[PDB]
Amino acid sequence: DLSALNPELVQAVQHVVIGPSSLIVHFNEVIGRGHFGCVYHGTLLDNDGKKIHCAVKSLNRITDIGEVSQFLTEGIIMKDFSHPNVLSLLGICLRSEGSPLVVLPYMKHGDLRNFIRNETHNPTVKDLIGFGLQVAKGMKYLASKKFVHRDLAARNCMLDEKFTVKVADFPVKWMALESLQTQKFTTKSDVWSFGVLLWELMTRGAPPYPDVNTFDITVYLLQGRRLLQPEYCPDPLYEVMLKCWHPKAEMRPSFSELVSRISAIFSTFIGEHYVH
């Protein structure tokens, strides 16, 4: 419905809500491919009088109060995040006859996987390490807030005009061993996924374990087998990836540790095509 919901919860989410008379969605201007849903070009008029171009995602017609309520508390959580490497929520739009709208800053270069996959772009080794370093900074921030991402991957990281990486969309070949067997997702589980994301970057967007099946991944990892060092990957960064794939979660590096480690490797490299 619109507000067959709890008054206290509706009050809690108000600060996230965008009035539709300050939002224009160009439903004829699509930016999505499908992965994030159906995403459109938007124009948002803020309370400050500033008119900005944005991305607007249209939800499936959510049909029960349990779902709408979970959606709203997710919105509340994302609105609270404030880091340059974590994607911002501009707000949500609850309309009378139609599904809710999620309003996000426009991300000029789309997601990180597709940016590095097309031959038109030429990221250096340093550029790719840089993207991973930005991802780690955002993930360090999220961990500091006690927040598990649960779906870290290069496809789920966005790149703006200033080439700032935005962690978004907070998948068995990205999952930690314990997540595959015991179904447990922690901050150390995100460290494993980060490792896979680094591997993705240093291969420029190659699919992980391309010759192992989704159901065969668990037995593969119990053979001590890991993803092989990518062609753009430096030896010291590969040892970072291996540490991310330790089967015991407590034995993996923290994101705070990954930031200082990768940062040190990054500072040794020179030559960039995509700065900031």
Added chain:
Amino acid sequence: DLSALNPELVQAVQHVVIGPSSLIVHFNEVIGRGHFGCVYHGTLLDNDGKKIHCAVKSLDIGEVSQFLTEGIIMKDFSHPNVLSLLGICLRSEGSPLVVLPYMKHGDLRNFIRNETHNPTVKDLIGFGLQVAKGMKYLASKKFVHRDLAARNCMLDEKFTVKVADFPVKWMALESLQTQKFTTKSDVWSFGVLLWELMTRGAPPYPDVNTFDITVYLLQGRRLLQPEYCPDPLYEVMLKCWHPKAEMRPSFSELVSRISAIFSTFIGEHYVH
């Protein structure tokens, strides 16, 4: 994992939280066999200071926030056939505690399966009518249960059925393929529940595998009429299992229909 959450969400949950100083938990006095988790006998002091016998379930910011909003949702429901939430207790050192009114006769599946109990065909239909009324209430709130089953309904002292815990062999055909749950998806699960009641707690589809259940229902095979189930009630069951979600009856129509079937019987060992 303390309240370093969004202040407005924390203020939204305040009406649901119980001050731990009004609660004693008997951690050495255990309730149940683990289906509902770690449940214990508790004593709760209400707003007037009245002692109330309760059951106490012992449970990242994302999970804790969703837990809180589910508590906000549950605390809002007010219907005799829906399990009420007395509150939640968010301790300084330890897991959140969920506080529920004590249900004397536990879950419905265990109660009917017990040979010591002698529910009549009318009693079992009555228990189904109670489930339907709670579900009609939930449907009216636009709320989907998602896990309706005999094991997930409770029985109190006055033999009031309380729908709780809001499972492939209870799942609707479109849930087994599209992963989508609706109020009509709940109607299907209710039919399996009615079947559970009439067979006095027999496992459904006992010979078929968990993964072979979707192809089983696609063939048009269903649960056979329970030995001691009335013909018009098995028709209700079959209507609840209609392959077209929109062709199944509403819980409002289930109430009235089952109310009628119930009324054509006499003989109750468990009166409500």
